[PDB]
RNA sequence: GCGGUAGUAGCAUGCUAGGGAGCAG
RNA sequence: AGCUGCUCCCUAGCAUGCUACUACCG
């Protein structure tokens, strides 16, 4: 009994075949219920026939006969069609505006989340429809994943090694760090707490959260939520006022904040200044230096997951007193610099899944590109701050959409903020990148990065390029091709001083296989933001649309500030990047 | 009966609800899971579950009515104004409630004095008033439960009295009904602690589906729910300056008691010509019919009536339990043997020995009757009939059998002795025989603790049926009260009816071609209802007028009295009604310019409209 | 009710009858154009009398579901009220005295009458007269129910603070005289 | 000339619902 | 601030029932 989604009018009718059960006014409901695959409408009572044994539940056919609603084959003479005038029968029949062009909502309703175009329309429409599309997308996500293979491991191989059995008739979903399960312990009646763990190459090896000893009888699933409706938009309306509103001018600053002063003012002088960030330019330092500039401000540490606020926790030990902060964690093993559940404290350390709804001055939204509109708009519901801070950039990598099937999402459509830096521009500019030497930062410039990144140090002269040979063979979800592994080990013998690296690969199963032959650790490309090594190892292994994507590989290119080896089965970036090439054994 | 005797030995902190700790999504509660009765022993619930997930509407309703969490979270209380057991104080201060005086309708009094009333030495004078009370009125009225004492019974005599009493209730039918078949008059009354913080009975009868009420009713057949009763003061006209209170029972009790008892209660109130006369009207010739039914064909008849001192606060618990069992005997096909026991336990835990909120504190009630529960006026009648039958048994068994001249009555006495103290099960033939004997020589007309009896005089002078002294003795040893013979009456001439019944006197008048019996009230009651009111709006006559029409209906039969100052009351009322109509109509012609037409409103100030209400050809 | 399919038909029947009345030719003029009119009788009877019943039934239905929506909202309101009350009285309760007596019980059950008697922190006494005051709580500490209590505050029937010096045998007739004593459990 | 039905108006009896008041236990 | 029973007044509605006027067919 509230406003409908497309008309802002009080109604009482809900699409029965939708997933959200949204409010739709009488003419607006007629439009949607004739123009799509939504065939049912519910009111204060469900518009269904009352003759025992009826299951035809369309919209037009039903007939109202007093204290009941019939079908034409169920109908005593005193009646009227429930569908007439192009207007379904329900409360507030008059004062509904309706809408003629509702094919956008119609497509969102019929959008089954397979094509890229689904995401394109879902990110091109207006606000509350943005919300409807987002929540339908996440609901369909959990319909997708939970109904797949049961993680019923029916024996233990060895220490951190298991034997696997899975659901029949329904296939089994990936076993990667992008896909985290959740444990339930069976007793003679029901289930008990186990927790979330990951599976990898074994014969199943599990990268467990913490120590556990499970015998037979146990099995796992990846649990989810029951996502409820939201409240607020993706962002607040902008400002162009005259004041640094709500805060206090400055006396002290450290001169390493020289590039910090110029952008402090713009974030607080107007509603929001949306931050774009190249890898390792000092953004978190800036996001910590915000409170350094004004000791009196409340700024709310957010992220995609806690592991990035743990980064803002790591540098919290560096700068600010521990008596003004609180690290909120839901009732998991993460970083905790402070005490939990102290909301009323100045510094708010949490993530989008943690903080209770309050009000604050500035919210430091971290790693935006790995967030979709839903988790982007939640804090807009929880926290009505006057100023926003969006640490992130669509330029790095988007959140894992398992329904990426046909096409690939461009950073124009990762979220609304993601095209916002591409429509109004980034209201952020930091040219001093402490990450990379004269090789990479100069190279990432012409890549996508606005020709704004350029050298800080000189050339370290070992960040070389080597384009490879390439042969293709896949098994389930990634590929193992020791051809791409062969030159790694065989050219490493030329440099024994090359044992300080990590072997990253787009095919996450390669690191689990390569470590048997190579010994350097593992790392997943898409969840590798923030972490860097001095010397790094990679093989692109192909130039399909998953890894070497010109905006999306660039997390692991700015990895090295000393030396790299970019093994290329590729043409995407070789003649595009700016390094030197050697011979292949 | 044995439990009543043995329970006076044990500490009084051991009776009442038994509580336990449960978890609702990891947060601990304290709830009732049983009961320790003084009469029924220890009772344990059958559906108890620790570690539940949520609470429905029904479980919230049950946990809110529990006294467990209200008393477990208040202060300790030591109230020295009473001898009753005090439990807890639910706030930080005590509340002292008063009662206000009445409002004076000066217009009616002036009109009545200009017609010759209230003269020196008149037979009609004012004796009904609104009496005021001060702050200590509620607790001093609650302290009258010190007259309830533990009473053990003659069990072999009671087990025979109950069979005869049951024979009195054979023409009716009862059983359980569903939630869509119960009927509520006036859904705009209070729901009773803690539920009067949020709405009236309409709120809870609307928020509950027909299937939630059925679930709650089915729940009370395996579990016990204790509730809380609130004590309220009344604001009414009276002839004595003592304060009056009523018990307000909570909604969780009424909702289920209606489903248990309403079929039988509505069967009783639709029967004519029986001993219990609840539901019979006195209008359109009904008073005459009742009087002729009670006269029956008794031989050398007299009339008699008696009273009960402190009836609702001196009733022993055993007779209250017995009344409940007699009322529940009609469930032989719908309810099992365990279901009926749990319904009895629920009744005892809610309206017999429950927790009472007087002021803002909780006390323990020893026993007696709660005035405002769902079965009051019918249990009172059962208690009445039980006491009368006991009086007759004691009259007949305490008579020297060697001097009885009739040979039928001697065998009756012999067999009555050996059906009390020698026979162990029920003998149906002798119960029928004794019932017939009583119905012929001892005829009763019963409302809820009022009575009139027509009896054989020659039998009573020889001690073969009950007299007024037998009632005195029975009340002394089975009720713990002394009944003074200055509040009883007797009448040896039948052509003037009962001296009193439901506050009415009787007159044999000539109506048309024959003679009929009419009821009339005390004139002071009607005049006092004229002069003193409980709202200031009722001190202007032209705003209602219907009040005076109704009060004139009540006063019509005084026109036939031999005392001339009694007919003047009816005539005064008619004159006043005419004056009020004229003064209301002569306002719309001056203050405004509205011409009202006398659309047959002249019938109200003529005697035919009122005479028609006492003549046998209905129009109800 | 004028835009019905038969308003035009009865209109044209009476219009032709008007045309013939301006004509006035034959006996069939009367018979016919009183029967062009006498056919357009059922139109404007059923089409204007069955349209007079469907609308009443529609209004009935709309009012009824208005009622049901309001009754459905008040239910949620009272649900929230009851929940808040229960969880509020929950937080004056979960002490360690309670768990201490509960764990000493052999099966988990205890009488309810001994919980305020053994776990409450505050006591309230109501005194009718001075003679009772002397025998119950004279001094500044007294013992009741196997414990020691310590007085804080005394008020009278008007909720006004009395001081312990005023309560005397010769000042007694100047006090509003139920007095209410508040004490705290001594440790 | 009558019957049947369909409309419209006025009148009574009964049932239900809502509101106002009076008495009794 | 309660549970019951009875009675008066006012409005709404439903069907029913009686009764009157018009039309159509037989
Ligand atoms: Zn709409
Ligand atoms: Zn729909
Ligand atoms: Zn149907
Ligand atoms: Zn039953």
Coordinates of C-alpha atoms and ligand atoms in Angstrom, one line a residue, chain A residues 14-19 22 24 32-33 36-40 105 109 132, ligand 2:
Chain A
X14 CA 1.7 -6.1 -7.2
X15 CA 3.0 -8.1 -10.1
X16 CA 2.8 -11.7 -9.1
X17 CA 5.2 -13.0 -11.7
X18 CA 7.9 -10.4 -10.8
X19 CA 10.6 -11.2 -8.4
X22 CA 6.6 -4.2 -7.1
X24 CA 2.1 -0.8 -10.1
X32 CA 3.2 -4.0 -17.7
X33 CA 0.8 -7.0 -17.3
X36 CA 5.6 -8.7 -20.8
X37 CA 5.8 -12.1 -19.2
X38 CA 4.1 -11.0 -16.0
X39 CA 0.7 -12.6 -16.0
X40 CA -0.4 -12.3 -12.3
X105 CA 10.5 -1.1 -17.2
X109 CA 11.2 -7.0 -16.0
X132 CA 14.5 -2.3 -9.1
Ligands
LIG2 ZN1 5.4 -7.7 -13.2

